[PDB]
Amino acid sequence: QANLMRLKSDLFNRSPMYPGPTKDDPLTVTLGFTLQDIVKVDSSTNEVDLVYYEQQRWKLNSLMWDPNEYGNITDFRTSAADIWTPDITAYSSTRPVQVLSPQIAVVTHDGSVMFIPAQRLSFMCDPTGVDSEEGVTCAVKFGSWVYSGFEIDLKTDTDQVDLSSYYASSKYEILSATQTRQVQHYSCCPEPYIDVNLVVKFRER
Amino acid sequence: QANLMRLKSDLFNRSPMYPGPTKDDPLTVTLGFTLQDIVKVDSSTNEVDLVYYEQQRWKLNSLMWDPNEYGNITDFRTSAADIWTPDITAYSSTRPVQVLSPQIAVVTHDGSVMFIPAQRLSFMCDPTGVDSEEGVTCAVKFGSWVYSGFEIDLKTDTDQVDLSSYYASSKYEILSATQTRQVQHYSCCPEPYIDVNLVVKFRER
Amino acid sequence: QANLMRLKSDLFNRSPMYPGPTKDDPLTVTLGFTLQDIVKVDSSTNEVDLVYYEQQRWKLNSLMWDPNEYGNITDFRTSAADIWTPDITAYSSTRPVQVLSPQIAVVTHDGSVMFIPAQRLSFMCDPTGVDSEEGVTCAVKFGSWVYSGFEIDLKTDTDQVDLSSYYASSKYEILSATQTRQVQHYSCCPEPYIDVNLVVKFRER
Amino acid sequence: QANLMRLKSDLFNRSPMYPGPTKDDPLTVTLGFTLQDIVKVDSSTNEVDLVYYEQQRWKLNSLMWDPNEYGNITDFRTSAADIWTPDITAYSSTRPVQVLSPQIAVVTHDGSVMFIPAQRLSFMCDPTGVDSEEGVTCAVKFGSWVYSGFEIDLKTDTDQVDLSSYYASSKYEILSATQTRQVQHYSCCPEPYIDVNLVVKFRER
Amino acid sequence: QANLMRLKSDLFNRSPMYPGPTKDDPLTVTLGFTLQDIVKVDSSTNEVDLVYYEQQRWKLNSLMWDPNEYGNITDFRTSAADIWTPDITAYSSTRPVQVLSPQIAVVTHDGSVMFIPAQRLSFMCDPTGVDSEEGVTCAVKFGSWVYSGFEIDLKTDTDQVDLSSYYASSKYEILSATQTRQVQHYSCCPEPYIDVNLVVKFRER
Numbered sequence A, B, C, D, E: 001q002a003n004l005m006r007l008k009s010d011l012f013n014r015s016p017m018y019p020g021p022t023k024d025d026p027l028t029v030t031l032g033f034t035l036q037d038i039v040k041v042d043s044s045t046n047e048v049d050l051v052y053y054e055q056q057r058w059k060l061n062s063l064m065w066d067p068n069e070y071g072n073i074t075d076f077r078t079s080a081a082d083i084w085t086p087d088i089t090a091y092s093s094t095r096p097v098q099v100l101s102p103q104i105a106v107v108t109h110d111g112s113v114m115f116i117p118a119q120r121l122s123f124m125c126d127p128t129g130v131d132s133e134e135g136v137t138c139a140v141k142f143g144s145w146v147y148s149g150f151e152i153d154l155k156t157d158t159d160q161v162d163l164s165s166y167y168a169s170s171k172y173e174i175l176s177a178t179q180t181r182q183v184q185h186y187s188c189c190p191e192p193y194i195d196v197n198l199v200v201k202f203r204e205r
């Protein structure tokens, strides 16, 4: 309690907040998805609503501390507003992302920050053939809105999406779910742009 | 009036806010449900809307005071933003929780805090067989999003859900309603994961 | 202008805000309703949407002043956020209350505060028989969420609801509208729980 | 840039904010409407949605300055939260007013403030006969919620509503649109109550 | 990291925020659109929902710095709340604009600021003839709500709208998309009013 109050004061009130990664000091943001349910499928507007967990993970030198100095505290929990968070957003989103969980991140002594917010995302997806046996395949690209490849480097611990937490009595069943890291190049800009393409193949139950 | 103004000033303006429970200093959060109505049942998207009271109860040493010192004041009411609140959220939620009551908590001299917000929750539930006599059973797990068993220990005063405040002229009648405390242990991590499973068996009137 | 600026400064900037009524210093909150329209009636979910004026009235010793001292000012208007307001909310509400008017209260020299916000409330009501000649009767209890009878004492100036401001070309006509003060007791505790029961009998036009 | 920063600092940071008009110091608020479109017409709930511009105009002695003293600056733009705004709201509104434009006001050297927010208003209107050639007439009264005639005096520069900005390919065409200043007198209270009655006669295209 | 923290501190914490452009010091705001999808088309209310990128670009002398002085930093990213942003809004909007991306702007050493927020806009558009081969043409004017031509001068780098990022499996295909700069003078006011007219010709797939 007392040691934890001193730790948060020496990390946020003492040192100024992280201004973001630069080309000289890049940051590696490892992200993984945990698909919960395909709630709505709109064939009239070509919109699909997803319920998932966006496991965001990054390591900062500014959020590093010795546990021995702060009463053997290895890790702590703090609000997402108190710390810097990556701007990883869906490029093909149709409606603003609805946060279903409290925005709280876990910070460890080595500076590794883990933030897993539960989100409801309505994105661009044509569901023509969802009632079919082969189903319909729909992709949605996730990545940094302003930072490029030289600033934020996206990573995936596994190519497979976590479907263990998926709703058993869902209206739509998953046939395939993959999170592939893609390195894109744009004519405008010489810098590369990394994006995690969430490809989901689903059909009606 | 005058003694109450001094009490709130000596508790919030003097001492810094609670940073959250740690492994060394755990917290026991006792929660109970009071089901009011099953407003909406969506068979098209497998979503069910519930109106209930989430009776959150926890004891803090920081919010302790002697009533004799503060003009025999045994308890007081303060905004939920002024004090620390547990991150108890539904794991199978589809849409953000709608708060129907003012977020105000009751703090007693022994440090016990009681916060009962009225909420509207839309969660994952297959209502196939709601028109049947046996009805349909739907569960929703409630627990801390970031804190584990070593930090927040969930508790239930009773295994039965309060149905005395349930709407008599509701579209759906309750056959069974139970709030069971579940302790999950995984091969990954040695920490326990406590969640209150709200199981409700209901049918059409 | 100049005398009014000094009055508001000597009342809010000088003295700290009202912490709420205690058992030793109780408060009498007189409330009355002015029904405007029954906008929506949902037979599918048993929800009824009401448009009304909640005339909240209470007297505080802290908001008392001599008009002769402040340039013969008898009363003034201030934002509902600047002053303390009672937590009077509908116990059978289904969706959060939508405020249709600016939240501004009128404070008189004797300390009497009048706050009349226009609200849209969607509450639990079975409308089976609204198309009938006798119509359907639906009640909704209004009261303090955290304070009991020893802290907040509810009062009604009249048992009849103001229907003079009711919409003439409404889809539903009012047959009866009453605001009854009800006292609820529990064996445990000696504190009474006062609530204003808004009973409305209506039918289709 | 530099002269404008000094001007805003000498007007808001120096002098305290306007507490509102009193009986001794009344304020004249001139308002005009610019109807854009009749988006929705609900015959089931007797609700009509309007898209319009509410041109609010008032003169304050506190917001007066000499342009010669502040580098020949005749007028400036500031947020609606930084200055005092009148509580002009629709008395027959069914849903909260949706603001479609940024809430920014234009303040001139003579103290005249102009605030024109684009709004979407859902109000009480029976549309029985909208498909007819003569159409349907629907009125909505606009006025101060707390201030009476002795505090806020409403004014209209013209009795005709601006229909030059009205959508040509709208589902409903305007036959007549008038903004009439009405003074209401009650035997109860000697104070008058001024309201701008927006009368619109429309039919299907 | 260290040089970037000093740069943001010397730009925002040192100098006060931009008060907005004046007649003496005008600002040129270059804006371009990147149409993603025509999600909804409502023939009942004459409303059309668009998903697009509003590329806002302006140069400020206050946000200028020498990269050699701040460790060869050419550009940085900061929140849209930390800096001044133009009040560019759609004049024919029916519902408030939904922001789908994080509001973060890119600031370069020469003072050029680029802010590209992804937005969902529901505006006035008659879709009679969308099922036809020639399709339906719908325009929406974009511009500063309070600042005139003498304060904010709108510009377009190209007359053609970026359709490279448009959804291939959309319900509606684009036949033509143009962003035309229009300078209109009104009888009311002596100042010119510049607006970017987004004209889109589309049909069903």
Ligand SMILES: NC[C@@H](OCc1ccc(Cl)cc1)c1ccccc1
Residues within 6 Å of the ligand: A091, A145, A146, A186, A188, A189, A193, E053, E116, E165
């Ligand atoms: N298409 C998604 C993303 O692409 C990366 C990118 C960024 C800037 C530019 Cl100038 C070009 C490309 C994006 C993000 C923000 C705006 C436009 C596009």
Ligand SMILES: NC[C@@H](OCc1ccc(Cl)cc1)c1ccccc1
Residues within 6 Å of the ligand: A053, A116, A165, B091, B144, B145, B146, B186, B188, B189, B193
């Ligand atoms: N499903 C909701 C919750 O489950 C508890 C839980 C946590 C971690 C692990 Cl490894 C297993 C289970 C949750 C909270 C945070 C992250 C992911 C999930």
Ligand SMILES: NC[C@@H](OCc1ccc(Cl)cc1)c1ccccc1
Residues within 6 Å of the ligand: B053, B116, B165, C091, C144, C145, C146, C193
């Ligand atoms: N039934 C609605 C409301 O009643 C007031 C009341 C408060 C406390 C107690 Cl111990 C009993 C009743 C309410 C509000 C909050 C919690 C439980 C109930």
Ligand SMILES: NC[C@@H](OCc1ccc(Cl)cc1)c1ccccc1
Residues within 6 Å of the ligand: C034, C053, C116, D091, D145, D186, D188, D193
């Ligand atoms: N209709 C909105 C407002 O009208 C002004 C008005 C004030 C007093 C009276 Cl007695 C009548 C009308 C209002 C505000 C409070 C109560 C009732 C109405």
Ligand SMILES: NC[C@@H](OCc1ccc(Cl)cc1)c1ccccc1
Residues within 6 Å of the ligand: D053, D116, D165, E091, E144, E145, E146, E186, E188, E189, E193
């Ligand atoms: N139609 C869009 C815009 O037109 C420019 C304009 C500005 C002020 C005035 Cl007094 C007249 C016209 C606008 C912006 C604000 C209010 C009304 C209209």
Ligand SMILES: [Br-]
Residues within 6 Å of the ligand: A017, A018, A082, A083, A084
């Ligand atoms: Br940080």
Ligand SMILES: [Br-]
Residues within 6 Å of the ligand: B017, B018, B062, B063, B082, B083, B084
């Ligand atoms: Br606390």
Ligand SMILES: [Br-]
Residues within 6 Å of the ligand: C017, C018, C063, C082, C083, C084
């Ligand atoms: Br008060």
Ligand SMILES: [Br-]
Residues within 6 Å of the ligand: D017, D018, D082, D083, D084
């Ligand atoms: Br002001």
Ligand SMILES: [Br-]
Residues within 6 Å of the ligand: E017, E018, E082, E083, E084
């Ligand atoms: Br700025």
